[PDB]
Amino acid sequence: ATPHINAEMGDFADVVLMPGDPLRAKYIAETFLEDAREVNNVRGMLGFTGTYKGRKISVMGHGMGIPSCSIYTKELITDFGVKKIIRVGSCGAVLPHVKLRDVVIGMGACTDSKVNRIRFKDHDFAAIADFDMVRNAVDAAKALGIDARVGNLFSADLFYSPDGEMFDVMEKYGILGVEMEAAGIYGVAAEFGAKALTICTVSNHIRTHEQTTAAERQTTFNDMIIALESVLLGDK
Amino acid sequence: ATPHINAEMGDFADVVLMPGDPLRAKYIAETFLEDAREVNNVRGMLGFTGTYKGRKISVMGHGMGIPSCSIYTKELITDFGVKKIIRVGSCGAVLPHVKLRDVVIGMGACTDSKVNRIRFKDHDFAAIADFDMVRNAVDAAKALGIDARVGNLFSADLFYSPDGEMFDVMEKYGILGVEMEAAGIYGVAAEFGAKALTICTVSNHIRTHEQTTAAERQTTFNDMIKIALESVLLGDK
Amino acid sequence: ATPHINAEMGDFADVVLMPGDPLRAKYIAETFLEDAREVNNVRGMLGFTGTYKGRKISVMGHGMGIPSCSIYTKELITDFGVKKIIRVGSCGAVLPHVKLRDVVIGMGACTDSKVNRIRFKDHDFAAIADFDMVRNAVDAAKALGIDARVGNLFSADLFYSPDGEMFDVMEKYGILGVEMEAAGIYGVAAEFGAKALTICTVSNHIRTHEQTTAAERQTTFNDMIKIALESVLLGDK
Amino acid sequence: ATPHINAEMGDFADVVLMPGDPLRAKYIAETFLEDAREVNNVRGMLGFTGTYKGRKISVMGHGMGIPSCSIYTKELITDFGVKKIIRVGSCGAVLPHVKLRDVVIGMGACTDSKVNRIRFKDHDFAAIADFDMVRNAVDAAKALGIDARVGNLFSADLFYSPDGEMFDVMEKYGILGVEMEAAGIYGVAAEFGAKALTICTVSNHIRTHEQTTAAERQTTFNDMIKIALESVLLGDK
Amino acid sequence: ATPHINAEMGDFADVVLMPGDPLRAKYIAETFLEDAREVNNVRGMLGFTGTYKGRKISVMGHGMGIPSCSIYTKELITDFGVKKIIRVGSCGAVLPHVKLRDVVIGMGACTDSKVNRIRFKDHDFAAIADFDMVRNAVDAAKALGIDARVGNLFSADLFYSPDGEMFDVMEKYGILGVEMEAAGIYGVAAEFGAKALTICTVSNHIRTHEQTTAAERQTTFNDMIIALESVLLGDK
Amino acid sequence: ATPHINAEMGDFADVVLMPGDPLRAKYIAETFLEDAREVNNVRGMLGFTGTYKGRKISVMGHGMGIPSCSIYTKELITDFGVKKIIRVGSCGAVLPHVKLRDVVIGMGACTDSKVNRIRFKDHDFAAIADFDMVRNAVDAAKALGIDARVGNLFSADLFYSPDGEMFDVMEKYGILGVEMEAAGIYGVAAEFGAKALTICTVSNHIRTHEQTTAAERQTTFNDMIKIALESVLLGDK
Ligand SMILES: c1cn2c(n1)ncc1nc[nH]c12
Ligand SMILES: c1cn2c(n1)ncc1nc[nH]c12
Ligand SMILES: c1cn2c(n1)ncc1nc[nH]c12
Ligand SMILES: c1cn2c(n1)ncc1nc[nH]c12
Ligand SMILES: c1cn2c(n1)ncc1nc[nH]c12
Ligand SMILES: c1cn2c(n1)ncc1nc[nH]c12
């Protein structure tokens, strides 16, 4: 057991899918995993282990923000044998050609957090996904007939930014989606020698809004959960 | 409703005690409040409203880290008429003369986050509590016979910090507790125009490596809660 | 003797009021102390020791700016047994509801100096006063019938700042007064192990451009001095 | 023409290979392209346009260092309709398991340069390659019987860095190769909306050394150019 | 009158010599200026105007540190018509070949202050003297048979540094003297369009100490006060 | 030999002239030196050693940008006993009174590069020339009937900067010329204990433009080389 996870080695699979919302982890285990057992409830951060097409898989919330997800991904890597983290989340778009319900894969993650500068002697650490995990996700999306955009996310510390001028900057430099975790998870994965990937669905357009239905949005969220099939591709 | 709270104006008291652990908010409402009703469960961040000695009072988790609690404290302040936030958390100690379950009152909060530099044009913003709230908490602690140190906390972004040497610097400058929120809450309170205070219980020593359990963290920090609730009463006078 | 003070251990009281203007220290000693003797004139930085209602008390200028007052507060703390520094200065106001001769108590001090980043590994050090000293000053002000706001000061390196827009940011974040020392004094107190507090009199408004004379700045700020001296008396209890 | 390229729109293919050493451009054009024509000579930075298996390709050196290649890549993109840039060159390795003449593909590039912080309001821009170009290079290498590593480069401003400890940090965080351009090319690509990739062969080990021979550095260069060119044809799909 | 100088246009010469110590300004007026009148005493920061070989010259303290001297040099430039500031001060040496009582001329001034980054959009502003003033000082020292070193000073914010490792850095990069004002004065002079020069005598060796006599040290201080003759050379 | 210079100790004079454009080195050697011999050719960066009025001089180009010239100047100083480096090149002007083909001598060099902050523990290093070399150049120019301005250069990392407002700041603080190397050469000179100077002719005005012709840029280049070479003889005293 670690200070934020009341579990033991073996309780997690060597791959963990992580949404921000602990209730969304419950949704995923119940919708997609067979024989799911709950393996953590400390601080309400529900985590589960079951099987997908016979493959052992865990899913667990990571909370909002780089500091929260850094705790959980660290402890999973160093104390529960986890090799792969797949964040499965929502993001806001700044580019006009990125539409509601697009699937975005973060090959890199920009940030206004200081955590990677602290790690990297105040220089620029390029916070990146594991390439093979990216490729597995692109291929799994193709097999399902979904086109995924691959590029940069931006991991914000302030959901409610006082700036607002920073969204123009993100647009100018081609940021595909704004969320709050990827850069921290990629930093954790480099620091402790594991592999990580962030996939997001566009849940709003920070400029404008666009228009869809609940059924359509929930369909795309389930499409993202690509993540499970990418694991199977990785297993080779 | 706000993007992270499914409630309406009036569901929250004008004062909200906030631990990081939503299960601890649930424990506070069951143990200390009367007629406690649940007013939020979005993302599992349980929030409750009830009364303490007749005073309407809410309690709601804020999650771990400056970005998490920044979301919740903002929405409480801008859409639910919340005037005072009292964070009631845990912290790790670096000073030798600070032992487990000691109560610390962060008049100020150091940080290695960039959020206040982003608000303050890259200068030093002294993240501070409301003075009257600090004094209320000190007086309530004296009336309860509970010791409490008043000083600087350090709000860390990395619970698992790769810079162990920074603990020596925290120690040198008298930091009473390492937690993960205060400096961001004080920044929100200033940005959005309310008042805040962080009280913490020392739950582990970073040097001695003695620590309290996860079950103890959510259900044994009762002195802190009493200080927090009684300090509201003094503030209402 | 230290490199900037020609005196010996015992010449200073354990509490030193310090304005920036050495002529103001001279005025304080003549007007408020009894049996005042001069204990330093190096570089014209006049310092005096006497008694206030029987309590040994010193007063000495610290010069303008964080680097100037850092020298003097350091030497007082490390070679003259000084335990408490009470800065008694002037400040410029940015908030509309803050008028000339208002008294401000800096529980914290923002700054655009780099000195605390250099002490604190480039992180945010919340430069704060001693809590008991702040409360002493608040209580002494109430007993004297003098209003006083408690909050953040901003310690500027550039009196003539080329960034006028930073005043808007100070205003947004509730900065009660722009002066040039508090954040450095609070940093010295923490580094070298003593306690400090800055009290300031609003001597000009940065927006309205109303200002007090240079002669008024050195001889009309009497309410502040009374608060400072009486707060020491409360602290001795 | 532009300040550093004396040519007209249309003289360059939409894909440009860029070695560092400008003398290698003429080599590539004569060894791997058909029907090559000279399209630039300003300050000895020779450029050529030709075909590889019918596909229009240009090649031109970029100089050493982020400021140099930032100039040439910008002008190609904004004034010559270039859509893809492939930098081909050498790097030094810090990882014990990365060996001399290994092929490294920079999906990302760390840097100690300030150029991206100037672009990105002093936040962290992740300087990344175009994903399809990365994958094209991996597959083209595979088809040539070459396993290629994919991960982070580090683009150093100072070949002779005074901070020997940074190489240990690079190794801790998995940096595959040290060179001097990738992060700057990636930033320009993002700034003006084109696509870029850096491929490097390991020419030396910062740990120990025992560098490579002459015919080995000839075989290995040819493999890298072959990989880059076949990757373009894969990108055409 | 300005907020820190109780004087009027005309009261100062268009060149001001400035030591840190207001008592040292009094010493200089009394030792070197004819018909000296005191023209400022606000905050005890004594300033004087007299003549040197018939040339009108002022001298005035500037206090310790960049923030203090920035106030006084600013107000002198924008409100009293001053064109040239010559700081005349003491510095500590870090180089082993820089000896006690060497005369050091700051063609540039390094600093750990943030004031020039604030002025210069967070980039590196090279805080420099006016070249002609440097050359006049070198020539005046030569005519007096004194060899002056010209190079970098370092302007510290903390006389009592918590670092201490920074002195090795200054030594490595050839810093001739450590004081507390030059970089701020050069920043003021660029910002408001005036000219400035810092001359220092080495009053200690931050490593080791060396050994001289009071009479010898006071002789070298008077040699520095070079400054007066450099003005006359500047007048052409 | 060094990684970028295939030569031996003694092949270079103790004084090296460095243009940016490497093709200018052969020009200088053939036009102003006697008995010139080729001493380097690695990646087309030709170097030559000869005499000017009996004085041994070398010339070799430095590439564009701080990282490029930092490599070559370092290796010359640490491995070829070089004592003085004179960079000769062009710059852009922001000041209305600085005119095309004016000669500018960089007593100091501002920069938006991070290299000196990496050297100087993130403080402000003033990147400065050697004073005697400055004065030698002024006097040599005077003797040729050329008035030369002396002050600050700005060494830009990005020729194509995304912050158009920085040119206004440069103009406010008196920058005489914008180029891309001076501050980096000055930092290397200080790091390894040698002497350096950058001389520039104004080739364009950032304000407006209306650049210079061909025979004008020929006359002006020759004047700059003449100034640099006569300045060396003045330095020999
Ligand atoms: C603006 C929007 N936004 C954000 N800032 N951060 C995270 C996020 N997730 C969905 N939408 C988001
Ligand atoms: C070491 C300990 N520690 C920490 N670092 N950060 C936050 C925190 N909360 C309780 N204990 C904590
Ligand atoms: C504007 C005003 N102002 C200032 N900036 N800094 C320090 C200070 N002391 C009194 N008044 C002050
Ligand atoms: C150490 C090594 N090294 C470097 N630093 N930078 C660029 C580069 N290219 C090959 N080898 C290199
Ligand atoms: C160490 C020494 N030192 C200093 N730091 N700063 C200014 C100064 N003037 C003389 N000696 C000095
Ligand atoms: C604008 C202009 N400019 C520049 N930025 N950098 C270097 C340079 N050399 C000549 N002209 C230049």
Author numbering:
A (entry chain C), E (entry chain C): 1 to 225, 227 to 237
B (entry chain A), C (entry chain A), D (entry chain B), F (entry chain B): 1 to 237
What does the publication say?
Mutation of Asp into Asn is a substitution of one polar amino acid with another polar amino acid having different properties, namely different pKa for protonation. This mutation still allows for the formation of a hydrogen bond between a ligand and the protein, but proton transfer from the enzyme molecule to the purine ring of a substrate is impossible; thus, this mutation gives insight into the mechanism of catalysis. When the mutant D204N-PNP with Asp204 replaced by Asn204 was chosen as a catalyst, the obtained data for N2,3-ε2APu was similar to the WT PNP (Km = 12 μM, Vmax(rel) = 30). In the WT PNP-N2,3-ε2APu and D204N-PNP-N2,3-ε2APu structures, the ligand is bound in all subunits, as the electron density in the appropriate region of the active site is in this case unambiguous. In both structures, there is one subunit in the closed (chain A) and two subunits in the open (chains B and C) active site conformations; thus, an active hexamer is composed of two asymmetric open–closed dimers (A-C, A’-C’) and one symmetric open–open dimer (B-B’). In all active sites, a phosphate ion (or a sulfate ion from the crystallization liquid) is bound in a typical position, at a hydrogen bond distance from Arg43* (from the neighboring subunit) and Arg87, while in the active sites with the closed conformation, also from Arg24. In the case of the D204N enzyme, small electron density blobs observed in this part of the active site were modeled with a few water molecules. The orientation of N2,3-ε2APu in the active site cannot be determined unambiguously as, at this resolution, the electron density blob is symmetric. In the case of the WT PNP, the orientation differs in the closed and open active site conformations, whereas in the structure of the D204N enzyme, the orientation is identical in all active sites. In the case of the D204N-PNP-N2,3-ε2APu complex, the orientation of the ligand in all subunits, regardless of the active site conformation, is like in the closed active site of the WT PNP, thus pointing to the ribosylation site either at N7 or N2.
PNP is a ubiquitous enzyme that reversibly converts purine nucleosides into nucleobases and α-pentose-1-phosphate, and is responsible for the regulation of nucleoside concentration within cells. The hexameric molecule of PNP from E. coli can be described as a trimer of dimers. The key role in the catalysis of natural enzyme substrates is played by Asp204, which is protonated, and by Arg217. Closing of the active site is a necessary step in catalysis; it brings Arg217 closer to Asp204 and enables the formation of a hydrogen bond between these residues, with deprotonation of Asp204 and protonation of N7 of the purine ring, which initiates catalysis.
